[PDB]
Write a protein that binds this ligand. Sequence first.
Ligand SMILES: [Mg+2]
Ligand SMILES: [Mg+2]
Ligand SMILES: [Mg+2]
Ligand SMILES: [Mg+2]
Ligand SMILES: [Mg+2]
Ligand SMILES: [Mg+2]
Ligand SMILES: [Mg+2]
Ligand SMILES: [Mg+2]
Ligand SMILES: [Mg+2]
Ligand SMILES: [Mg+2]
Ligand SMILES: [Mg+2]
Ligand SMILES: [Mg+2]
Ligand SMILES: [Mg+2]
Ligand SMILES: [Mg+2]
Ligand SMILES: [Mg+2]
Ligand SMILES: [Mg+2]
Ligand SMILES: [Mg+2]
Ligand SMILES: [Mg+2]
Ligand SMILES: [Mg+2]
Ligand SMILES: [Mg+2]
Ligand SMILES: [Mg+2]
Ligand SMILES: [Mg+2]
Ligand SMILES: [Mg+2]
Ligand SMILES: [Mg+2]
Ligand SMILES: [Mg+2]
Ligand SMILES: [Mg+2]
Ligand SMILES: [Mg+2]
Ligand SMILES: [Mg+2]
Ligand SMILES: [Mg+2]
Ligand SMILES: [Mg+2]
Ligand SMILES: [Mg+2]
Ligand SMILES: [Mg+2]
Ligand SMILES: [Mg+2]
Ligand SMILES: [Mg+2]
Ligand SMILES: [Zn+2]
Lengths: 206, 123, 53, 122, 113
Amino acid sequence: TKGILGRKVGMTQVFTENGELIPVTVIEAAQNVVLQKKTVETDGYEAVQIGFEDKRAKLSNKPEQGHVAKADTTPKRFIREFRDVNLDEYEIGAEVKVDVFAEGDIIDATGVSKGKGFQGVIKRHGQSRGPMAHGSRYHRRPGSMGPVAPNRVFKNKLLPGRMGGEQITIQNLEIVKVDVEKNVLLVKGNVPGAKKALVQIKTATK
Amino acid sequence: GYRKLGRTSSQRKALLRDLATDLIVHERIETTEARAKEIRKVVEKLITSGKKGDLHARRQAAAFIRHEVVEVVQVKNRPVYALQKLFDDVAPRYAERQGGYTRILKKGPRRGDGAPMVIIELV
Amino acid sequence: AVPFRRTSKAKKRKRRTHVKLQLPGMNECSNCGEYRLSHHVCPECGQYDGKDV
Amino acid sequence: MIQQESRMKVADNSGAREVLTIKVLGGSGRKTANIGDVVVCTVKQATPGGVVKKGEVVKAVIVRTKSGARRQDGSYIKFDENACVIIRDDKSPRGTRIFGPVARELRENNFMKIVSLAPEVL
Amino acid sequence: MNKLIDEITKSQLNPDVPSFRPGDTVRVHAKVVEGTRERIQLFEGVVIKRRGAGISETFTVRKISNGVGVERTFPVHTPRIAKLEVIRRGKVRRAKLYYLRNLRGKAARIKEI
RNA sequence: UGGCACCUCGAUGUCGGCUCGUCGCAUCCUGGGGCUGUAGUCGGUCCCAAGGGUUGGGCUGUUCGCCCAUUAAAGCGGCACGCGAGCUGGGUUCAGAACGUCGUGAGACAGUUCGGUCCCUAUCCGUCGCGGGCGCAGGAAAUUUGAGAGGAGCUGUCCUUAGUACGAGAGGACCGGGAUGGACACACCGCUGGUGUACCAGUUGUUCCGCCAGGAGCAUCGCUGGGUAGCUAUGUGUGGCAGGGAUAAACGCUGAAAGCAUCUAAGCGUGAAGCCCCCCUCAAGAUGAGAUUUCCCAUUUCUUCGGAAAGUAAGAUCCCUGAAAGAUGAUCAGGUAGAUAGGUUUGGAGUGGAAGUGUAGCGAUACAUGGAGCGGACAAAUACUAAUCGAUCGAGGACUUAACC
Ligand SMILES: [Mg+2]
Ligand SMILES: [Mg+2]
Ligand SMILES: [Mg+2]
Ligand SMILES: [Mg+2]
Ligand SMILES: [Mg+2]
Ligand SMILES: [Mg+2]
Ligand SMILES: [Mg+2]
Ligand SMILES: [Mg+2]
Ligand SMILES: [Mg+2]
Ligand SMILES: [Mg+2]
Ligand SMILES: [Mg+2]
Ligand SMILES: [Mg+2]
Ligand SMILES: [Mg+2]
Ligand SMILES: [Mg+2]
Ligand SMILES: [Mg+2]
Ligand SMILES: [Mg+2]
Ligand SMILES: [Mg+2]
Ligand SMILES: [Mg+2]
Ligand SMILES: [Mg+2]
Ligand SMILES: [Mg+2]
Ligand SMILES: [Mg+2]
Ligand SMILES: [Mg+2]
Ligand SMILES: [Mg+2]
Ligand SMILES: [Mg+2]
Ligand SMILES: [Mg+2]
Ligand SMILES: [Mg+2]
Ligand SMILES: [Mg+2]
Ligand SMILES: [Mg+2]
Ligand SMILES: [Mg+2]
Ligand SMILES: [Mg+2]
Ligand SMILES: [Mg+2]
Ligand SMILES: [Mg+2]
Ligand SMILES: [Mg+2]
Ligand SMILES: [Mg+2]
Ligand SMILES: [Zn+2]
């Protein structure tokens, strides 16, 4: 059970040894370092705090410079935690390379979905339209809201709103190729998010 | 994704051609904010075409410039048109300058409808 | 699609608590010596960035 | 992609000449069949003297489609009309000859006799 | 277009493919991999289209066999093409030759440069 | 199906469909078990179980029903016969006309047939999303625990075990292992396709740029053939996998009351798609306001103590350039400590061989210069143009007790 943070670059395809063609997504994971180590007797749980991508001296304030200077290295841009991981590894300040994964492993990809604005109900919840002819005047509307008796409308009545932008994870996703010197990682499939999105790679729970 | 300016495709192209030609002739015009931000790019591409100085480039530019007289010179009265000014006066001015032939300066809201007016000039 | 009961004064004012309008973002031109809008050409001395236009 | 109410030519030597599909077998709410799928169908146009008569309810396999299939290696194959072959209770055709090319996906579904009888298996 | 994708995928490009443009006859020595057999079958026809960039470029070949027209699409750089030959060099005025889908014989014939 | 006539006649819209569902269990399928006229396969009946599933058409305004073809199955009911300020009006139930019948007649029939106006800008609660204020005994920047709450629990076929157990034969397994699907859900645009009104080309009519050549306006984007970025499904990847604790029906162990027996009285063991977990998401306004790391410190004057204001620190905002975000706020990337946007120079997709000139042909036209020219949104360098200058907000930490600082 090991994990890294990454930056989604794009998506392409590669040919396997058998000749079959598969789609892959390219994730680059350079510059990520170990910052803090949470223990049960100090915080109540065990975790490892990983800082991913460094940024300029400007854009970073004094408190976070102090936090990173509690270890080595410059201020970072993304910081996340990993639970259910061994703590005997991960010396403070040591970097994490993509070589912690081998070809044929199974990972879980976590990220933030692409954003859709104020979206209707045929698109957000996948409902069905009314007839578009035969004298109908009811095309893309939510529907009825229930019986007369309650004098109200129940909860979880699906209605239009802001669609995208939530956190999503997908499981049992295979890893194809690892290239250490380019700090890249090829994963068969697709992961949530737009380009340049933060992607969290971790060993599959199941 | 450029910018629709409250008007259809054929109307929008006609508006852009009018403002681009008005900026070549007078060199200093006052318009709204989005409208100036849009004509900036077309005027700069047109000036690049003038920088090239070819006959093919001249035809490319002539497919955009409105045909109107800038001023008349006594060579014998012979008017000079906007394309002639673009290829003889405006383009040689920025021969040594690569990009950014225009600047935008903000003014303040219009009285009638509160539109944010700016002044755009080619220097 | 029609009001069941008329609105009291308290509820009307409570709704109107947010219908104010904000203060302009202005400061003083170094050359003029009086107020002007930031990132705008001051109309008194007719200058921007210390240069007349 | 063929669902109920679709018409498609027959590509064998039985009496049928045109076939309208009735049902798609293999699921409760299934609504589309492709190359190598069996469908219940009715005979609309038939040739005189054939073994299979007009207005008969038979089940038959799909041989070629307008939108074909993709292989594991990344290649695709598409035909120019929809065709069909009328089969028995087992996977043996009722006719004796087959016209036109046949997709290779019939091998994996154990339609061996049809593939053998086909002039060209692509 | 990304440069990192190009650097990763540059290894698997095929340098042995010839130069062809849509509108000329080619012959494909495609390999047919059974469960425990290896055979090469020949597909010959005119190329209808060629689209994409990089490793993800594909081309389409059209053939009329037994009256029924058959179109088969290949990736350009696939390892399953033993050899690709250019037989003829037709003359066309289009990049996509979709109009041939509605033409029978003696009217779909293509001139030669 | 009825009885009564208690609210509504200063109006409680009445049948079927469509969209959206949600509850009950008297369970249609799937899960567990007892009995069997339970040899095996296939079944019947009852008990525990509501977690998810529970088709597409022909006829009829039809609910219903009959029929065709599938399926593991095509459950029965409640919610103003759920749902018309959500939809349609085929039917009922206005004015026209006609048939059969009744009436002397005007007319009538819950007998039939053809045609017949469906109004409303959401105030309060409710539901779905998004902000501002204050609180949380100093002011801030990040990372988090999880009380609680939503989401998902579906199922087929083939091979092997094995022609084995069983059985006179006919026929033909439970359990176990493997492969691959149906419907549904989430994400994404590398592939197959759709769109793509500031991309490329062909072409008709007419007007214009003084004329030729080359172009422009209008004609649905004039029409036609392609198509970049984005958005997409019918396309692709993945999911409901294995499991733990306590139980229901049921099956048992040990065991007295009742020297025997007994699943019960004390005490233990097995045991379900169900309960609580595992899995995914929200979550400290959880006023019970939690935790960890790091930063700034203890200033100056008025007060009757209490307390007040007034310059600031760490930090944030006004204002400006924007998109990976977006109705508007908000969120994110930047503001010369600069690649945030436009431009410029190189590229890429896409289209398909530009203008000028030359040659061949009487001419339409063809060939060469030349994978040419053009090229919105895509990539990399470059400070050339605009993010100039400033301003505003923002802490000095109450009391009591205990270990001890
Ligand atoms: Mg976080
Ligand atoms: Mg309409
Ligand atoms: Mg109530
Ligand atoms: Mg037009
Ligand atoms: Mg191409
Ligand atoms: Mg009475
Ligand atoms: Mg009333
Ligand atoms: Mg019961
Ligand atoms: Mg039983
Ligand atoms: Mg249930
Ligand atoms: Mg009919
Ligand atoms: Mg009702
Ligand atoms: Mg009733
Ligand atoms: Mg009732
Ligand atoms: Mg209602
Ligand atoms: Mg309304
Ligand atoms: Mg009479
Ligand atoms: Mg009428
Ligand atoms: Mg708030
Ligand atoms: Mg909880
Ligand atoms: Mg047998
Ligand atoms: Mg696509
Ligand atoms: Mg002419
Ligand atoms: Mg005109
Ligand atoms: Mg078009
Ligand atoms: Mg037409
Ligand atoms: Mg399970
Ligand atoms: Mg147990
Ligand atoms: Mg707190
Ligand atoms: Mg960009
Ligand atoms: Mg900022
Ligand atoms: Mg730039
Ligand atoms: Mg040419
Ligand atoms: Mg000549
Ligand atoms: Zn001034």
